[PDB]
Design a protein around this ligand. Structure first.
Ligand SMILES: CC(C)C[C@@H](NC(=O)NCc1ccc(F)cc1F)C(=O)NO
Ligand SMILES: [Mg+2]
Ligand SMILES: [Mg+2]
Ligand SMILES: [Mg+2]
Ligand SMILES: [Zn+2]
Length: 890
């Protein structure tokens, strides 16, 4: 296909200074008239003027009021408008076009589209070209004057970026509104919305300059009651950027708008952030707990882009991580601050080490700054986002808070109102590093390898203690596996946050310190170490790596009980589970392949189980943390450690381990499930959509995790508890009652009960679909067909499609049915969805990413479905690129 390379970046021959748009919405067409005030740059060599413009119907084209004609002065092929160089002026000129577009049939949700009864845009990355002609790349910065007109009854609220400077009536029951956005921007940050929207509003006064900012949050009328928590989260986001980063908002007004049909979470259009409704709307009677967290993070994220993305933007799309990795890091700092729970940071680590590590070991592996693409849209990945964020976070670990803040301000101020590159960020952080080291020859040149080198480093350790000298050494090695991006991998700058625990008394033996590993291996020596320690390594998960702790399970148990760092405690537990999972998996696999009539399994370590019980019974230990220790590692995590994985053998492995532990702990689990009830389900704040007690939410999470364990175990009379739980006013509880009832005859009664509770709220119904989809049912295939026929039907809403299918794809036993029927079902959905929404179709490909990790029968079945999809006529460039890369053809 058509491949863009990072190395070939060149500035344009043209400049666009001002954009003046009139967008006239009618029932069966929208007319877009656009004037671009343009000029020739210093890089111009008299080339043709080529605009991006996809699927536009041309009404008229002119330059300086001279009409241009197709075949004579221009060509248009439905993708690019070429104005021949003879007709391109040599100094400042006005380019005029008028085109017709059709939001009402735009089911791809990119460009201008209709979502229920709201007209909305999505322009990042390449959507502005589906609205009007432009040099649609992020270095083409301009100022925008936008007029929107529409039928007043249908579309009473009209929004675009920036200050509303006029509103006017138009004959025939229409009206208009004009916007001026004074901030220079790329076209990917343009937005318009038209709808019958309702709002909540508040005034925010900025901390330093005392600027009054009007905050509006919008939804369709039915769901206006679900806007309050978003507004609160916006205030929190603003205060956080003021308090931590010294950054104030820069317009008089900020609008946030929920729409039902959206490809991803939300979008940072200047002054007009647009959200998937699932990431803006909640109410405590109609939303699960996880919604509150999601809204907090997504509102935060879009808000933080106002500097990291908007005020400082991208030179080109290869720099994507500069805005997304950095914004996710800001969002994560914010979330950790607002929730004050250790499970926040653990949740980010869990996501990285499951999904992103899988990606990084797959044929899709890329560095956080890719070298090439066909469709830029395929690079909005957990690598670019989540590994990017960890790369952005490592600067803070290396520098500390004070020097990190200095470097960040160098960056943000130097590049204000302009484009930037990853190098500019690394240069700013390098100035801070020099200051920190008090050495103007220190450099971060090695650090750039985190942007250019793909793959996850493996860091391993060896320890030695000299009792006579009271001297302890940690010898560290790093390795990155060669891959298609680099045949020779170089050592990275890896910060290793470390503590040392005395195993006798469980106490800290050193000031926490950060080891700076820069070579392939190094030995770090500590004096005045009074007894042999147990090391507490990569505290806070200080780099995005595979950690090989080389600790015994006895040492791991001591850290789990006694270490200060929540990640090291969690990882020590993770490691004990992984050792057991790999050992039992190999035992089961050998028995199966050798057709043994009898064999042995290694039992779960009894001292580890005792440790779990000790933590669970400690009334002062954290409820969220407890829910992580009784859960095995996620399947996507486990699979990074197994080649030729037999998923059935893995399923049997996990069941054996869970059963071993429950045989010891179920009575503890039951006692805690009951004892936590009063505090977990207390109704303090149940009517307050401005405040969430995240500790209490983690108590519900722990109850629900325990209830699942006990239900799968068939603990005596647990069905009574399941039925009581379905009467709870918390949706998290009553939907958990449905999933845990899977193990009982009462499942279809709870299916109906909860359906009735969910069906009248669009977002709650989607959460019910996910609950059904992930249910541990032998008849799941018949249940999915019932969802398709009775609920999903012909929906093109990405949230409905994702809700029905993705959870099911995580059913290890059923999705990977050795017949291949799981792979076939999802491939049919992908191909169907690709005919109207290529981005969503590529999202639905997610289960196939691990195909070359599976046993060879399942590899063959997956491959056969991937190649079937590839053969589909009129396959999108998005899906075709994804599948060609994934199957080692590109
Ligand atoms: C171009 C914009 C639309 C990308 C947006 N990314 C984003 O929302 N990711 C979350 C996400 C949510 C739902 C989903 F199904 C898939 C996703 F990748 C983001 O970074 N917003 O700032
Ligand atoms: Mg069209
Ligand atoms: Mg997030
Ligand atoms: Mg709907
Ligand atoms: Zn973003």
């Amino acid at each position: 296909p058509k491949i863009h390379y990072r190395k070939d970046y060149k500035p344009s021959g043209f400049i666009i200074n001002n954009v003046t748009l009139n967008i006239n919405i009618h029932d069966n067409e929208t007319i877009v008239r656009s004037v671009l005030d343009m000029d020739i740059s210093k890089h111009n060599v008299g080339e043709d003027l080529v605009f991006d413009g996809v699927g536009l119907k041309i009404n008229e084209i002119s330059i300086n009021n001279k009409k241009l004609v197709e075949g004579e002065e221009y060509t248009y092929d439905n993708e690019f408008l070429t104005i021949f160089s003879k007709f391109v002026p040599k100094s400042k000129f006005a380019f005029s076009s008028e085109v017709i577009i059709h939001p009402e049939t735009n089911y791809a949700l990119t460009g201008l589209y209709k979502s229920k009864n709201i007209i909305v845009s999505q322009c990042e990355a390449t959507g502005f070209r589906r609205i009007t002609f432009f040099i649609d790349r992020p270095d083409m910065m301009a100022k925008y004057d936008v007029t929107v007109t529409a039928d007043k009854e249908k579309y009473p609220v009209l929004l675009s970026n920036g200050d509303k400077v006029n509103e006017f009536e138009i004959p025939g029951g229409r009206h208009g509104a004009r916007f001026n956005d004074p901030h220079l921007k790329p076209c990917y940050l343009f937005a318009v919305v038209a709808g019958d929207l309702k709002h909540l509003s508040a005034t925010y006064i900025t901390k330093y300059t005392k600027k009054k900012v009007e905050l509006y949050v919008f939804s369709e009328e039915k769901y206006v009651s679900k806007l309050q928590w978003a507004l609160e989260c916006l205030k929190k986001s603003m205060a956080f950027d003021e308090d931590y980063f010294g950054l104030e908002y820069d317009l008089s007004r900020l609008n946030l708008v929920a729409v039902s049909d959206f490809n991803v979470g939300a979008m940072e259009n200047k002054g007009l952030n647009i959200f998937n409704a699932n990431s803006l709307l909640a109410s405590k009677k109609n939303s699960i707990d996880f919604s509150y967290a999601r809204i907090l993070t997504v509102v935060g994220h879009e808000y933080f882009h106002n500097y990291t993305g908007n005020r400082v933007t991208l030179r080109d799309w290869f720099q994507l991580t500069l805005k997304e990795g950095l914004t996710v890091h800001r969002e994560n700092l914010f979330s950790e601050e607002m929730t004050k729970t250790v499970t926040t940071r653990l949740s980010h680590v869990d996501l990285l080490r499951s999904v992103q590590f899988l990606e990084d070991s797959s044929p899709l592996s890329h560095p956080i700054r890719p070298e090439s693409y066909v469709s830029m849209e395929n690079f909005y990945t957990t690598t670019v986002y989540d590994k990017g964020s960890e790369v952005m976070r490592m600067y803070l670990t290396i520098l500390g808070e004070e020097y990190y803040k200095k470097g960040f301000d160098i960056y943000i101020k130097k590049n204000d109102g302009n484009t930037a590159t990853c190098e500019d960020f690394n240069y700013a952080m390098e100035q801070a590093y020099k200051m920190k080291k008090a050495d103007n020859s220190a450099n971060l040149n090695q650090y750039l390898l985190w942007f250019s080198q793909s793959g996850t480093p493996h860091v391993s350790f060896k320890y030695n203690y000299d009792a006579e000298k009271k001297q302890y050494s940690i010898h560290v090695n790093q390795y990155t596996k060669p891959d298609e991006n680099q045949k020779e991998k170089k050592p990275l700058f890896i910060p290793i946050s470390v503590g040392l625990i005395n195993p006798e008394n469980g106490k800290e033996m050193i000031s926490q310190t950060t080891l700076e590993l820069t070579k392939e291996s190094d030995t770090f020596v500590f004096n005045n170490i009074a007894v042999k320690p147990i090391p507490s390594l990569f505290r806070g998960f200080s780099a995005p790596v595979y950690i090989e702790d080389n600790l015994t399970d006895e040492e791991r148990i001591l850290l789990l009980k006694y270490d200060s760092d929540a990640f090291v405690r969690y990882n020590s537990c993770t490691n004990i589970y992984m050792k057991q999972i790999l050992m039992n998996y190999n035992e089961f696999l050998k028995a199966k392949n050798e057709k043994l009539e009898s064999f042995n399994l290694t039992p779960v370590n009894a001292q580890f189980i005792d440790a779990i019980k000790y933590l669970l019974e400690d009334p002062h230990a954290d409820a969220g943390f407890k829910s992580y220790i009784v859960s095995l590692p996620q399947d996507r995590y486990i699979i990074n450690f197994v080649s030729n994985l037999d998923t059935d053998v893995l399923a049997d492995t996990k069941e054996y381990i869970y059963k071993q532990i429950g045989d010891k702990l179920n009575d503890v689990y039951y006692k805690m499930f009951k004892s936590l009830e009063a505090k977990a389900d207390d109704l303090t704040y149940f009517n307050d959509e401005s405040h969430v007690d995240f500790d209490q939410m983690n108590m519900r999470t722990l109850r629900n995790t325990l209830l699942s364990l006990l239900s799968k175990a068939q603990y005596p009379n647990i069905l009574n508890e399941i039925i009581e739980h379905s009467k709870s006013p918390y949706p998290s509880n009553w939907l958990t009652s449905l999933s845990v009832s899977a193990y009982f005859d009462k499942y279809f009664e709870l299916y109906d009960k909860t359906y009735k509770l969910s069906k009248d709220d669009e977002l709650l119904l989607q959460e019910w679909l996910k609950t059904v989809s992930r249910s541990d049912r032998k008849d799941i295939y018949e249940i999915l067909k019932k969802l398709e026929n009775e609920v999903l039907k012909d929906s093109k809403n990405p949230n409905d499609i994702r809700a029905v299918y993705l959870p099911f794809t995580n059913n290890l036993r059923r999705f990977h049915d050795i017949s291949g029927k799981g792979y076939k079902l999802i491939a049919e959905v992908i191909t169907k969805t690709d005919k109207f929404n290529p981005m969503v179709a590529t999202q639905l490909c997610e289960p196939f990413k691990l195909w070359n990790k599976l046993d060879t029968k399942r590899q063959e079945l997956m491959l056969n479905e991937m190649n079937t999809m590839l053969q589909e006529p009129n396959i999108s460039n998005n899906l075709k690129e994804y599948l060609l890369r994934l199957t080692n053809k590109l």
